[PDB]
Amino acid sequence: SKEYHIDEEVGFALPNPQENLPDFYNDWMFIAKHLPDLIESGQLRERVEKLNMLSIDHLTDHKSQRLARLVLGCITMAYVWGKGHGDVRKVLPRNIAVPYCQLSKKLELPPILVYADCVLANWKKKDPNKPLTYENMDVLFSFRDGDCSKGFFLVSLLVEIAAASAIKVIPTVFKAMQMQERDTLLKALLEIASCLEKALQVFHQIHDHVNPKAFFSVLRIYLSGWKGNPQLSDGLVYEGFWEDPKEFAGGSAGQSSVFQCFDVLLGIQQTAGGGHAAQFLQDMRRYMPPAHRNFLCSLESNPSVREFVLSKGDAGLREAYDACVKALVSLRSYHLQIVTKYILIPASQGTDLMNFLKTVRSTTEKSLLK
Numbered sequence: 001s002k003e004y005h006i007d008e009e010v011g012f013a014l015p016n017p018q019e020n021l022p023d024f025y026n027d028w029m030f031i032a033k034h035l036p037d038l039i040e041s042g043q044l045r046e047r048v049e050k051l052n053m054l055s056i057d058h059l060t061d062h063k064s065q066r067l068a069r070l071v072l073g074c075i076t077m078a079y080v081w082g083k084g085h086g087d088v089r090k091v092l093p094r095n096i097a098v099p100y101c102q103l104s105k106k107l108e109l110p111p112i113l114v115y116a117d118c119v120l121a122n123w124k125k126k127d128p129n130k131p132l133t134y135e136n137m138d139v140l141f142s143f144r145d146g147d148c149s150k151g152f153f154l155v156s157l158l159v160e161i162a163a164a165s166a167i168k169v170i171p172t173v174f175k176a177m178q179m180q181e182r183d184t185l186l187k188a189l190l191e192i193a194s195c196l197e198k199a200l201q202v203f204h205q206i207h208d209h210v211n212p213k214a215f216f217s218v219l220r221i222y223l224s225g226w227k228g229n230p231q232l233s234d235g236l237v238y239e240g241f242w243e244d245p246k247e248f249a250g251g252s253a254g255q256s257s258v259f260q261c262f263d264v265l266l267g268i269q270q271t272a273g274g275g276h277a278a279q280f281l282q283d284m285r286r287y288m289p290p291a292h293r294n295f296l297c298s299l300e301s302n303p304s305v306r307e308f309v310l311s312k313g314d315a316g317l318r319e320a321y322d323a324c325v326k327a328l329v330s331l332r333s334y335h336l337q338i339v340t341k342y343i344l345i346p347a348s349q350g351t352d353l354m355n356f357l358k359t360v361r362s363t364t365e366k367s368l369l370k
């Protein structure tokens, strides 16, 4: 692990993310930092339009570029949707479009706000000597006041941090299988299940910080996109970069690499009963960071953990492997409960979504050995 950008402490999340772009981009930053004020007043769309075109050239390191994708990204979402009641912009101004697209090309993500932007790179610690807890963290950018962006973004991040405890054990799994050290392998699988159980309890926290009405009626809007959206049927026009409107999905609440990570480790094959499900999971990889998709691919290139357990007849190991599979099923199940609370109940003012989630979970539980 090194080419793949996975931190021992925070995993798929960006470690110690940059808070400030070069001053050359002060204009970008000003708008992104005032989205709450500037959206509520309707001054956002105007100011995005009075903006000069700045080169991406002074954004030299990875973090600077990731922060740009984040600021230019929020600005874009706020610009397209405005206050959220019909007045949509179908064309993004060149001066913000071309940099956003050029930066996206370099960083290999679609030009639309993505989970790697608004959750993984979107945090700082208040006090750096205190730990990584909600009471000691904060986000870099929010959209509108009372949008519960802090809660959703941070509680999501803290799950990613929790999951780092299980991801760090992955090399140990493979080393044990290579040097045929069966007890080290057994503790390893056992620690992964456990870390995933802590991961689950962390996910309980979402209720303490995210209000269902606020989420659905406010924040979900700036997270929403333009693939199959009746509001932007033909996509979005990135002025000056493509002449034709292009479609990209707004999927930030479903773009984490953590479930597919342990899909891949345990050799859970997500097509065994899945006409559409596999395509959808594979589309989600395209909205993950390139290193993170490279990682998942690299993982499948390792010798199968599952094949190894099934080829020993060791009851302790099967029991341990199942513990991990059970843990992934508990995450995906709790997750469903969250979608029911934060999407289904509020949408009562969809079911083809639920079955997709349900399909993905069942093949997972079906991948058990006992």
Ligand code: HEM
Binding pocket: 152, 155, 156, 159, 160, 203, 206, 210, 215, 250, 251, 252, 253, 254, 255, 256, 257, 258, 259, 260, 284, 332, 335, 338, 339, 342, 343, 353, 360
């Ligand atoms: C309010 C909180 C959440 C909501 C409303 C939510 C909603 C959704 C939705 C609607 C999808 C599938 C379709 C789409 O992309 O729009 C999805 C899938 C997914 N969500 Fe969430 N999610 C939430 C929290 C989380 C958290 C904290 C994580 C992980 C840190 C997560 C991980 C995933 C993953 C990995 C998928 C892909 C399906 C899979 O691999 O099983 N979600 N979620």
